Amino acid sequence: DIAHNLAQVRDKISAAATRCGRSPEEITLLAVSKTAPASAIAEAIDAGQRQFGENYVQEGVDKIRHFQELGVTGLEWHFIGPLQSNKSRLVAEHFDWCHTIDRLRIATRLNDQRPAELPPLNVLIQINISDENSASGIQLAELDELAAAVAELPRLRLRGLMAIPAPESEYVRQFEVARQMAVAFAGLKTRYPHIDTLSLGMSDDMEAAIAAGSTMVRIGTAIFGA
Ligand SMILES: *Cc1c(COP(=O)(O)O)cnc(C)c1O
Secondary structure, three states: OHHHHHHHHHHHHHHHHHHOOOOHHHOEEEEEOOOOOHHHHHHHHHOOOOEEEEOOHHHHHHHHHHHHHHOOOOOEEEEOOOOOHHHHHHHHHHOOEEEEEOOHHHHHHHHHHOOOOOOOEEEEEEEOOOOOOOOOOEOHHHHHHHHHHHHOOOOEEEEEEEEOOOOOOOHHHHHHHHHHHHHHHHHHHOOOOOOOEEEOOOHHHHHHHHHHOOOEEEEOHHHHOO
16 A cells, blocks of 8 residues: 555654654655556545656656646656657656756757746756666766756756665665765765755665765655566
């Protein structure tokens, strides 16, 4: 049951934050609903969840339109999958956040495709921190350059960083990789305005990411099931 899973996940988040001396309010739960049907999202919505993460543009847009047709207010939709140039218009027209900025041309497209009547699209820059098998995300060495370029796009708002670390079994490495992101995040916060979002941690590494300094865990299966 989705309402039960939501409350439980939220308890683990709340425990994990206070144990490491953090207010639980600091951590946002992003309910990842890729491969969940709109009916499962509706259950989470009714239980109070407002923030949802989608990986595949067209399915995400279908879910967004479904709930617009119902009139549901206060939802916040995060695109967290890799963004292809031929589908960037759909993200710019329908989503509130995009976590996967890893090249300037895609961010310029998003900027130029964002309808004028909408507020700026909130974006995160994606770091490939530890995954030699992913083509998504930049190296940390490229961050200062890309962040400066993206920060000038007036139809976007740079909010921080996202990473999908390579999967790790040892809690030690989970923490250590998450800390590299946390360190990059704090360094970025010392010069850029409104840097407040570090999208870091999934179901299996949630405690390490929070201890490392994540502000936003992306939880799918522990909420919606397989
Ligand atoms: C699917 C996915 C998640 C959620 O994964 P779970 O293991 O089900 O918690 C989080 N972030 C991204 C980028 C994903 O693609």
